Amino acid sequence: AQRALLMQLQQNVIWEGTVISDERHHLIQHFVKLRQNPKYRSSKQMMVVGGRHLLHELHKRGYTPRHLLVREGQQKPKWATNTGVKTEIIRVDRHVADVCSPGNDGFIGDFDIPKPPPKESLIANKQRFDRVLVLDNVDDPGLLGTVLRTAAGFHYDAVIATNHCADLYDHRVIRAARGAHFQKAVPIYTLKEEDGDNVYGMLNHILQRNDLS
Amino acid sequence: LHALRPHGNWDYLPLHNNQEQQETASLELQGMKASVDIGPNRFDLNEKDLSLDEEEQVEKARLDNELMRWRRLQRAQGSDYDHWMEAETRRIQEMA
Amino acid sequence: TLIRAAVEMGFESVLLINCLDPFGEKALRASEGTVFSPQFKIFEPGSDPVSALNSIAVEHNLLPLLALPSQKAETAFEVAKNLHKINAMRRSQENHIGPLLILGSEAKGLRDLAGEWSVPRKFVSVPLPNSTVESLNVSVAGSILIHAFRPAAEKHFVELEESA
Amino acid sequence: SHARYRPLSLRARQTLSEKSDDLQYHVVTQEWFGERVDSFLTCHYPQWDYETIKRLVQQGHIYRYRKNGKKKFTRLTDRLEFDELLVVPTRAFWEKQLAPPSGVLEETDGPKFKLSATAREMAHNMVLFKNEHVIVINKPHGLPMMPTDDPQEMSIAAMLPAWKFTNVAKPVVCHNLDRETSGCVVLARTRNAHRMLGRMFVKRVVPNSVYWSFCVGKPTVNYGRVRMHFDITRGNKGDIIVARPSPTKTSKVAIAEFVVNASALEFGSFISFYPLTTRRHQERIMAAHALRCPVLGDAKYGGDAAFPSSLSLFWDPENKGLPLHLHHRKIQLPYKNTAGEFICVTAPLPTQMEKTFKKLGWPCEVDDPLIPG
Amino acid sequence: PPIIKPPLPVKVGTLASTRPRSPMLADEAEGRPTRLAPSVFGRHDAPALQRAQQECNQLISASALARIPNTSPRAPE
Amino acid sequence: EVTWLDGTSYVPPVLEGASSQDLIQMVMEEAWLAADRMAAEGRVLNPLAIDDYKWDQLVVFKKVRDKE
Ligand SMILES: [Mg+2]
Numbered sequence: 001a002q003r004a005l006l007m008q009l010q011q012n013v014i015w016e017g018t019v020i021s022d023e024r025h026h027l028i029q030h031f032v033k034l035r036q037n038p039k040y041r042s043s044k045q046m047m048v049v050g051g052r053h054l055l056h057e058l059h060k061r062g063y064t065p066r067h068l069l070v071r072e073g074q075q076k077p078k079w080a081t082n083t084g085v086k087t088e089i090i091r092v093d094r095h096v097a098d099v100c101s102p103g104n105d106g107f108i109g110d111f112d113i114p115k116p117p118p119k120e121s122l123i124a125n126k127q128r129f130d131r132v133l134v135l136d137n138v139d140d141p142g143l144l145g146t147v148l149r150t151a152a153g154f155h156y157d158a159v160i161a162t163n164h165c166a167d168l169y170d171h172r173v174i175r176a177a178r179g180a181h182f183q184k185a186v187p188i189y190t191l192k193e194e195d196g197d198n199v200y201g202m203l204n205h206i207l208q209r210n211d212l213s
Numbered sequence: 214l215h216a217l218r219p220h221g222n223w224d225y226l227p228l229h230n231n232q233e234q235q236e237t238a239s240l241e242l243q244g245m246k247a248s249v250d251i252g253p254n255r256f257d258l259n260e261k262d263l264s265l266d267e268e269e270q271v272e273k274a275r276l277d278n279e280l281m282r283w284r285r286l287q288r289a290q291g292s293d294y295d296h297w298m299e300a301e302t303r304r305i306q307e308m309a
Numbered sequence: 310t311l312i313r314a315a316v317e318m319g320f321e322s323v324l325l326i327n328c329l330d331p332f333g334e335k336a337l338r339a340s341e342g343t344v345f346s347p348q349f350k351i352f353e354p355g356s357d358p359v360s361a362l363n364s365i366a367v368e369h370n371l372l373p374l375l376a377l378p379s380q381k382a383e384t385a386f387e388v389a390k391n392l393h394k395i396n397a398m399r400r401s402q403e404n405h406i407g408p409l410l411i412l413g414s415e416a417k418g419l420r421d422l423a424g425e426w427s428v429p430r431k432f433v434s435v436p437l438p439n440s441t442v443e444s445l446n447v448s449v450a451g452s453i454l455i456h457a458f459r460p461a462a463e464k465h466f467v468e469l470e471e472s473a
Numbered sequence: 474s475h476a477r478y479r480p481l482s483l484r485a486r487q488t489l490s491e492k493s494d495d496l497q498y499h500v501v502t503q504e505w506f507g508e509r510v511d512s513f514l515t516c517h518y519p520q521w522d523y524e525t526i527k528r529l530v531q532q533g534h535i536y537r538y539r540k541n542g543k544k545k546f547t548r549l550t551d552r553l554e555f556d557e558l559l560v561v562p563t564r565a566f567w568e569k570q571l572a573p574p575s576g577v578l579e580e581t582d583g584p585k586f587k588l589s590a591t592a593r594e595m596a597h598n599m600v601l602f603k604n605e606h607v608i609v610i611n612k613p614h615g616l617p618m619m620p621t622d623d624p625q626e627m628s629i630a631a632m633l634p635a636w637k638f639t640n641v642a643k644p645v646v647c648h649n650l651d652r653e654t655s656g657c658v659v660l661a662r663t664r665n666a667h668r669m670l671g672r673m674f675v676k677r678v679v680p681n682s683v684y685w686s687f688c689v690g691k692p693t694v695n696y697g698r699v700r701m702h703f704d705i706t707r708g709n710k711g712d713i714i715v716a717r718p719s720p721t722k723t724s725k726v727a728i729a730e731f732v733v734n735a736s737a738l739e740f741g742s743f744i745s746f747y748p749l750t751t752r753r754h755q756e757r758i759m760a761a762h763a764l765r766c767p768v769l770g771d772a773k774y775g776g777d778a779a780f781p782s783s784l785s786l787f788w789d790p791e792n793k794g795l796p797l798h799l800h801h802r803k804i805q806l807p808y809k810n811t812a813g814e815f816i817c818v819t820a821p822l823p824t825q826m827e828k829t830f831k832k833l834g835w836p837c838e839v840d841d842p843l844i845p846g
Numbered sequence: 847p848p849i850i851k852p853p854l855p856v857k858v859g860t861l862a863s864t865r866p867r868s869p870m871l872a873d874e875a876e877g878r879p880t881r882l883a884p885s886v887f888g889r890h891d892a893p894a895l896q897r898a899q900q901e902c903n904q905l906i907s908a909s910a911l912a913r914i915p916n917t918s919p920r921a922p923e
Numbered sequence: 924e925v926t927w928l929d930g931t932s933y934v935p936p937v938l939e940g941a942s943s944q945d946l947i948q949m950v951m952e953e954a955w956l957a958a959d960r961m962a963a964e965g966r967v968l969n970p971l972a973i974d975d976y977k978w979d980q981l982v983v984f985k986k987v988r989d990k991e
Contacts, residue, residue, distance in 0.1 A: 001794040002615050002652075009615075010627045015592045017625045061441065088589060118985065124978035126252040131219045146446055147214070153437045153445050154218040176446075183441045210251070215453045218436070224386050228473040252975060260983050261944075298869045497851075498886050502908045504879035511867075512874060517882055519857050523867060556908050563887075 019072065019091040023099045027067070027090065031100045031110065038167040045113045047169040047181075048100075052077065052107040054178055059085070063182050065109035071097055074106045101171060113169055117187035119197075122158060122206060129157040129210045134203065141166040145176020148188065152180040161190040162199045311412065314452040316343045318459045322350040326358045327418075363427045366409060373409040373426065374433045374458065376450055377419055378443075381432035388433050389457040393466035408458035412451045433457075478572035486571065490534075495566035498538070498558040510537075511549040513559070525576030532574065535561050586631045596635045602818045606666045607659060607806060608636060608644055611820045614655040614796040618646070629658065636660065648674045651754065653770075656684070656801020657820035673807070680730060680747035681805040683841050684756050685822070687798035687829060689781045690766035691739040696732045699763045703727055703752050714754070716762060727752040729759055732843065737833055740783035742766065745802070745841065757799065769829075770797035787832050796825045803841050817846030849888065849898035850906065853881045925950060927957045928966060 010018050012026055020028065034041050035048050049055060049065070058064070059079040068080055069092040080087050087109075097104040133156045138144045144166050151159050166173055168181060168190060180186070191199045206212065215221075227233035248254060265273065291297070315323060325331055331344065331351055343349060354361035366373055372392060382388055389408075396405050413419040423430065435445065435453055444450065456462070481489070505513060514526045514535065527549060529535045536544045539557040553559070567573040588596075602609035612618070617628040633643035644660035645667045661667035673681065702724035704715040717724060728749040736742045744764075746756045757774055761767045767775040769784065772793060780790045788795055805817045822830070822837055830837045856879075866872045884904055886895070895906060905911045925933050935949045961968055 001792075005794070006615055006617075006626065013592055013595060013627070014589055015627055016587060016589075017627070057443075118982075120978050120981060120985075124975040126249045126979075128250050131217060133214070146449060149442065150214055150445050150449050153435075153439060153442050154214060155438050156219060179442060183439070185439055185441060215435075215456065221386075224384075224390070225469075258979055258983065260987055263980060263983060263987070294869065298872070299865075302865065302872070494889050496889065499883050500885065500906060500908050500911075502853075502883055503912055504881065505883050508878075509874065512878075516856060516878065519859065519863060 014090055019093065020096060021093050023096050025096075028096055028100055031069070031108070034110070035101065035171055038170070041167065041169055047111050047113050047174060048171055049109045049111050049174055050101050050103060050107070050171065051105050051175075051178075055079075055107055055109045057179060058109070058111070058182055061179070061182060063111060063114070065111040067110035069097065069100065069108040069110075071104060071106035077107070103175075111182075114182055114184075117184075117189065119189055119202075121187065122160075122189065122202065125210070129206065129212070131156055132206065132212065133159045134162055135159065135165065136162045137164040138166065141170050141172035142176050144168075145173035145178075145180070148173065148177040148180040152177070152183055152186045156186050159186055159188040160199075160203075161188070162203075163191075163193050165190060310339045310448045311451045312340045312349070313343045314448075314455050316346055316349045318455045319461055320455065321348065322352060324352050324354065324361070326354060359422060359425050362409075362422070363425075367427060369407065370404065371407045371409045372429065372431070373411060374431050374454070375411040375419065375423060375426075376413070376454055377423070377432045377434065378416060379432045380434070383434040383436055385433050385435060385454065385457045388431060389462070390466060390469075392458065393463045394470070396463055397467050397470065407460070410451070410454050410458060412447060412454070414447065476568045477570065479570040481571065489569065489571050493562075493566055493569065495563045495568075497561045497563055499561065501553050501555055501557055501559065503555070505553060506555050508553055509549070510535075510547055510551055510553060510559070513553060514561075518561075522576050525574070528574045528576055529562075534574070535559070585634065588632065588635045592632065593635045596632055600636070601657065601820060602816070603638075604662075604808065606662055606808065607670070608662060609804075609818045609820075610636075610658050610660065612650060612654070612656060612658045614823050614825070615652060617652050618649045618658070621652075633660075637662075647671065648751070650801070651757075651799070653797040654799045654801065655796060655823050655826070656799070657804055657818060658801075659804065659806075670807075674751060676750045678749065680749055681844060682748055682801060683803035683844055684746035684748065685798075685800045685802040685826075686744055686746065686756070686760060686768045687826070688742050688744055688760050688764065688766040688768045689740070689778055689784070691736045691742045692731075692733060692744075692764045692766055694733075696730075698728065698730050699759045700726065700728045701759065701763060703755075703758075705753065712753075714758065716758060725752060726750060727755045727759070729756055731759070731764065735835055738783075740781065741769065741833070743830075743833075743835060745843070747843065757797075768798050770795050787829070796823060798826055798829070800826060803844055805844060805846050815846040817844060847887070848902060849886060849890065849894070850902040850904050851885045851887060852902060852904045853884050856880050856882060925953070927954075927961070928968075929957070929961055929964070931957060931960075933957070 007018070011020060011022070014020070014027070023029075023032075031048060034044060034046055041047065049058070055065070055068075056077065056079060059077075064079075064085050064087050066086070066088065068077075068087050068089050070076060070089060071092055071094060076089060079085060080089060092100070092108070094104070097106075097108065101108055133147075133151050135144065135147060138147070138161075144161075148159065148168075161168070168188065174181065181188075191197050191202060193199055291300070312323060330336060331353070337344065344351060362373070365371075374388065392406070392408060399405050411419075411422075423432070433454070435450060437444065445453075499513075499517070508516075510530060511523075511526060514521070514530070515523060518526070526535075530547070530549055533546045536546045537553070537557055537559045538544050539554060544560070562577075567577065596610070599610040599612070600608065601611050612629060617626060619630050620626070620628045630646065633645075637643050640662050642664075644662050645664070647659045647661055647667065647670050650656060650658055659670070661670055702717045702720055703726075704717070704721065704724055706713045706715070720726070730747045730749070732745050732747075734743045734745055744760070746759070748755060754774070757768060757771055761771060761774040767778050769779065769781075771779050776793075780788070780793055780795070782790065800822055801820060802822075803817055803819045805815055808816050810816050819840075827837045864875075866875050884906065886898070886906065890898070899905055905914070925935070927933075933953050935946055935953070937946065958968055
């Protein structure tokens with residue numbers, strides 16, 4: 001009994017030499033709560049990203065997660081093993097990785113949510129906005145992620161999400177966007193009427209200020 | 214989005230390649246980019262331009278006095294004979 | 310989604326090489342019966358893609374355009390304008406030439422066909438100025454290519470030529 | 474391991490030093506006339522540490538010969554003399570059956586372990602008292618102090634690199650504790666501090682440690698002095714401990730002073746031990762056999778009476794996984810605070826022992842006036 | 847393997863090495879010779895020691911080292 | 924030379940050791956005094972409110988509050 005309790009203790013205290021096998025682990029519970037609960041996700045300011053190639057691109061850009069879950073049978077990333085990174089690496093089994101994320105490529109990064117752009121630019125911008133995208137009441141996250149991806153590709157001056165939108169830090173939108181949240185070219189702002197900010201007031205101010213149709 | 218993408222009107226600006234090439238670019242076209250259109254042109258905007266209130270000024274003076282007394286107290290804290298001899302021989306090697 | 314875009318913008322037939330399932334249920338969900346439509350004809354070549362494409366191209370007098378990540382020609386709008394201008398010149402002379410679209414996944418497999426394409430060939434891409442993102446979704450790129458080389462857009466391009 | 478060291482008396486060490494030939498006889502020319510021995514050695518051997526030179530000179534491995542036929546031993550403060558020799562052992566001198574001091578050789582740390590942020594937070598939580606000389610931590614229950622047979626099992630001896638907040642090297646544990654003991658563990662920061670504090674943990678007459686325990690049953694006397702002689706012998710799978718009342722040439726004595734704080738209807742009792750020796754499972758075996766009342770949870774010594782039907786009301790006798798009620802409550806230190814009283818640090822009881830004391834109505838956090846400070 | 851180690855110039859010390867063990871010891875380090883002291887590398891007899899001396903061109907006895915200086919007898923031009 | 928809405932001429936003296944911030948403080952103190960004079964004489968003055976300069980200043984305010 002003492003050996004079993006000490007093994008479970010080390011599992012909770014993942015100190016090198018053990019892999020995770022139970023979904024009741026604190027880190028797996030943190031991952032699944034960050035994936036499901038949007039309020040807890042916004043309170044923790046973290047997100048879950050899947051894909052070794054996407055994680056490598058984020059590292060190239062300069063973004064690295066504080067936690068990485070690698071599936072057994074796959075090697076460790078060079079960008080995760082180099083000395084400049086502070087990313088902890090944890091071995092994960094197949095079914096617990098599926099419980100963590102519904103789609104497991106073998107690499108799951110617990111990234112820090114990039115700070116949303118300050119609305120002060122949209123309020124009082126020096127340069128004139130050429131074209132601004134306004135997404136209104138999108139239901140499924142796939143379409144939202146794809147339109148974020150194509151907006152980042154076409155380099156729109158600003159993107160706004162008005163009055164209804166899937167949480168931009170959700171796994172599906174993250175997959176369908178592939179770095180649109182981490183990039184800093186196209187600023188995106190989620191204006192939720194229930195939060196106090198007037199979407200139509202903001203839009204009419206932008207119009208009357210930048211002479212937009 | 215592909216229709217109303219940014220700079221998508223450049224295909225319609227020039228009605229013909231000959232008419233487009235007839236125009237000659239000048240350094241004025243480069244110079245006009247440095248001027249912000251909506252806002253007025255200003256020289257510098259740094260942290261020193263931030264005006265302070267009376268409470269902020271009093272707090273800053275208090276922090277400066279605290280820093281002064283902290284330097285004074287560290288002159289005696291680091292005066293432990295080991296570190297004091299260390300700094301003394303370092304100054305000697307600097308001047309020599 | 311690609312089949313639906315093609316048939317909604319007015320495409321007649323489609324070719325599938327190395328496709329997973331032309332009638333899988335998860336594909337029919339996104340297609341919304343557009344593959345079942347009678348005016349939309351699907352085809353399948355047997356391990357002979359180059360001989361399947363070059364023959365039909367040289368027979369039906371069609372211009373192929375490949376959506377490659379190469380930077381040969383990135384202005385799909387100007388490429389479509391040139392194609393519609395050639396079509397309008399043929400119409401004024403009076404046959405018409407139709408657009409072939411090539412949407413692929415692997416650059417190696419696309420070069421394997423580009424190195425053996427017949428005359429004339431053009432590599433068309435999308436105007437993406439951001440170096441951060443690699444490329445758009447293949448479905449979005451195909452939809453943009455169809456919107457460019459739509460057989461109904463020839464009338465609007467003739468209107469553009471008249472207005473210019 | 475090309476040289477296997479052997480025990481050596483002073484006579485044998487002198488005989489080997491005389492017989493050896495791996496020596497270096499430095500003359501003292503006019504340039505080194507009157508220089509101190511320590512300055513001479515620190516100027517001649519840049520690779521030898523000052524503490525190493527001190528140990529060599531004060532032990533006598535580096536002596537001087539004044540041409541008088543006999544060798545002369547000096548301290549560090551002694552001045553040299555013209556025309557005389559200074560004898561220094563070489564590298565090959567320590568390759569015989571003569572054990573060298575610690576500093577003269579090079580000790581390789583080898584492989585190091587990489588700790589996670591969660592483990593570092595757990596260590597910072599375990600830290601109780603921090604000082605520029607000593608660090609006191611609260612070791613949890615069921616944790617191995619030293620790496621056991623299984624190399625994949627965690628231990629405290631490998632958590633050392635996470636405790637050096639500013640030191641150049643990891644702290645060193647002063648005394649080891651049993652796996653089941655849930656007490657406080659002391660670490661020394663300075664290599665000299667470890668040597669200075671190692672004297673406290675030898676057999677003594679006045680106690681400076683407190684062990685809170687909950688035994689099954691009430692002993693005869695409320696306060697007493699337990700003493701028994703242990704014999705440890707190697708066996709097939711483990712060790713055999715033989716306890717005797719009478720001394721023996723091979724026996725090692727074990728002494729403690731026990732005080733019964735409270736009694737729970739003569740079926741359970743709370744007691745405080747103050748040991749005077751350091752023996753394996755000392756207080757546990759004392760409470761098991763001498764007091765004739767085993768501590769609740771000592772399955773290895775009297776497992777049947779460990780989990781009693783009496784206390785079965787509170788805990789399930791079929792699980793047999795409750796933490797052993799063995800807590801190093803209070804331990805003194807030679808260091809004084811600003812008030813002048815010696816610093817005696819106290820470790821809080823684990824949550825399971827707190828639950829037991831709450832179910833029994835006894836206060837969980839009480840000061841121990843027997844050991845002052 | 848030389849039998850007699852001749853004097854060698856002292857090694858340049860780092861900061862911590864040239865730092866004395868005490869600020870009062872910081873004064874003894876003022877006068878120090880720039881050369882180490884010669885030595886022997888074993889226990890040998892008188893003929894072996896004399897042969898090592900004549901081979902390495904170095905004397906062992908400090909008395910003789912001081913009494914016999916290597917001086918050019920000629921007068922300076 | 925500084926001329927206000929009324930037309931009064933004021934000259935901030937410039938001496939050695941006087942900094943640009945010193946001159947700014949002098950000019951702004953005299954400007955507050957002149958504005959008090961206008962309001963007492965009866966001249967109406969545009970009041971201070973939130974402007975694009977105030978937003979550009981909150982930019983560096985956010986910068987310094989994120990710094991420390
Ligand atoms: Mg003894």
